[PDB]
Amino acid sequence: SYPKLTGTVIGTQGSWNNIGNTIHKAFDGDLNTFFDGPTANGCWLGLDFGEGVRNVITQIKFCPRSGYEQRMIGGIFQGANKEDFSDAVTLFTITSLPGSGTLTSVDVDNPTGFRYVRYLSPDGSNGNIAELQFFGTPAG
Ligand SMILES: [Ca+2]
Numbered sequence: 001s002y003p004k005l006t007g008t009v010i011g012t013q014g015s016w017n018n019i020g021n022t023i024h025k026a027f028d029g030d031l032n033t034f035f036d037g038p039t040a041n042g043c044w045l046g047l048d049f050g051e052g053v054r055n056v057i058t059q060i061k062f063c064p065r066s067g068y069e070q071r072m073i074g075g076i077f078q079g080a081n082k083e084d085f086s087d088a089v090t091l092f093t094i095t096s097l098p099g100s101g102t103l104t105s106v107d108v109d110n111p112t113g114f115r116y117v118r119y120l121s122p123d124g125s126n127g128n129i130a131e132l133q134f135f136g137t138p139a140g
Contacts, residue, residue, distance in 0.1 A: 002058045005134045010083070011045030011118065014038035016126055026119075026132040031101055034065035034130040043127025046118025047134065048083065054113030059135040060092055061103040062119070065128040072098050072129065074122035079114035091117075103131065113139025 011023040014037070021036035023045035037043030049055055057079055064072045072094050080088040091108045098104045117134050121127040 002135045002137050005047065005049065005055055005057075005136055007047030007049040007053075009045065010048050010116070012037050012039075012043045012127060023127075026129050029131070031063045031103075031130050032066070034068075035127050036065070037121070037125075037127035040126055041123045043125065044118050044120045045127065045129070045132065046078075046116060048116050049114070051115075054081070054115055054139040055134075055136045056111060056113055056139050057091055057108045057117060057134055057136040059105055059107055061105045061131075061133040061135070062094075062098065062129060063103050063131040064098045064100065065130050066100055068125075068128045069098050069100055071121070071125035075125070075129075076120050077108075078118055078120060079110065079112060080116045080118075081114060083116055085116070085118065085120075103133065108136075 016036040025033040078088040
């Protein structure tokens with residue numbers, strides 16, 4: 001069990017109907033608060049660990065938005081070393097309905113060190129996710 005990783009929150013700007021459920025709601029420790037993106041499609045969020053910082057990812061945990069758990073199916077998690085994710089690799093693909101009101105934990109088996117990680121949401125989701133956490137260790 002490796003430590004939870006910290007970084008700068010990156011991703012889609014804004015929120016649905018300008019209510020204020022921005023990407024930051026996925027990193028606040030509250031499973032009741034969620035990201036609700038401004039558009040149905042294209043929403044994403046994640047971390048930049050910082051210039052010169054690369055982590056090997058060993059585990060990801062996530063919690064869906066309550067009542068909208070199906071909006072995570074088909075979402076993927078990616079690691080990259082370009083902020084545009086053009087070099088990205090998929091670390092995990094959500095294929096089953098996540099349980100409500102809890103963190104689902106998934107193992108990652110990829111030895112690559114990444115500066116950037118993200119959740120890339122499927123069409124029709126508004127990016128909906130309540131909490132997102134990455135675990136791992138500095139790349140050797
Ligand atoms: Ca939250």
